Amino acid sequence: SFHKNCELCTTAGGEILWQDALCRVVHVENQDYPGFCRVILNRHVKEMSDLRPAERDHLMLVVFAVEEAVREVMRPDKINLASLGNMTPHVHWHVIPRFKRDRHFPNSVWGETKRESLPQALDQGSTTALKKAISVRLD
Amino acid sequence: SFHKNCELCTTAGGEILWQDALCRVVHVENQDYPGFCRVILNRHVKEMSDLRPAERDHLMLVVFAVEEAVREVMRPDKINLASLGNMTPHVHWHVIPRFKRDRHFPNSVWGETKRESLPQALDQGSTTALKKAISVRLD
Ligand SMILES: [Cl-]
Ligand SMILES: [Cl-]
Numbered sequence: 001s002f003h004k005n006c007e008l009c010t011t012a013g014g015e016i017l018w019q020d021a022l023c024r025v026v027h028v029e030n031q032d033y034p035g036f037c038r039v040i041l042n043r044h045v046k047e048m049s050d051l052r053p054a055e056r057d058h059l060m061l062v063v064f065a066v067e068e069a070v071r072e073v074m075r076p077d078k079i080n081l082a083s084l085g086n087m088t089p090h091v092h093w094h095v096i097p098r099f100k101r102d103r104h105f106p107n108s109v110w111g112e113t114k115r116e117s118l119p120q121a122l123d124q125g126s127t128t129a130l131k132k133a134i135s136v137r138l139d
Numbered sequence: 140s141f142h143k144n145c146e147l148c149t150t151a152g153g154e155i156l157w158q159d160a161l162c163r164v165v166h167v168e169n170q171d172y173p174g175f176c177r178v179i180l181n182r183h184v185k186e187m188s189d190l191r192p193a194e195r196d197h198l199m200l201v202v203f204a205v206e207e208a209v210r211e212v213m214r215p216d217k218i219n220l221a222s223l224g225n226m227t228p229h230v231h232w233h234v235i236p237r238f239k240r241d242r243h244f245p246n247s248v249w250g251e252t253k254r255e256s257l258p259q260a261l262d263q264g265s266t267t268a269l270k271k272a273i274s275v276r277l278d
């Protein structure tokens with residue numbers, strides 16, 4: 001339910017862009033990846049296959065709506081999606097806009113750094129646009 | 140449709156465990172990660188959101204079946220799920236069984252190694268057990 005020592009039970013995880021009963025979407029303020037968002041399950045569950053099929057589905061619909069919003073607002077070269085949870089075993093999806101000359105490309109963002117990069121952190125305008133784009137698709 | 144220079148248009152990608160029209164499930168032979176499976180879309184498509192919602196849904200069903208089968212056969216500490224495609228932009232999902240004693244834990248498998256880990260490659264019984272577990276769920 002709620003583990004008092006799990007950061008995703010105890011913290012928002014970033015600026016909340018959208019939420020419902022099942023989950024929340026946040027902009028993670030990552031200096032190397034503006035527009036990096038996470039879909040975080042509200043309750044503490046370890047694996048996607050711990051969820052009932054209907055919950056799995058609802059969660060994945062939010063993830064794909066967030067992919068679409070990030071594509072539209074950020075216009076990235078590639079989208080990466082991942083649910084890892086090795087350090088924090090509480091279901092959460094990274095939705096990451098990648099660019100050919102970003103810090104790590106074509107490595108994953110968890111891999112070796114490839115180049116210097118200096119992407120402009122999101123402005124209120126972009127953050128707003130992300131919120132609108134997610135809302136359009138989910139509300 | 141078919142990109143002649145794309146590894147996932149021109150190779151099985153591993154030993155095939157299950158397939159239908161839309162996709163195939165393979166066991167990736169990775170000496171550090173027995174039970175690493177991949178769900179590869181059969182045609183060339185760059186992003187998940189480039190798929191029709193009926194196709195996204197079905198692919199994700201296959202992914203979640205493979206997750207459940209890997210958990211049953213491998214009894215991992217954690218599952219990692221990921222669609223990256225930075226090096227090969229053809230939709231495919233990594234379904235990775237992780238263990239506390241694996242090479243990278245709690246890093247992602249793309250990160251720095253933390254320990255020695257020389258695991259036993261899967262026997263015919265385990266690979267066959269994966270095929271059966273996947274098939275029972277999808278057929
Ligand atoms: Cl993670
Ligand atoms: Cl990849």
Ligand SMILES: [Zn+2]
Pocket residue numbers: 002003006007008009010043044045089090
């Ligand atoms: Zn938690």
Ligand SMILES: [Zn+2]
Pocket residue numbers: 141142145146147148149182183184228229
């Ligand atoms: Zn291809």
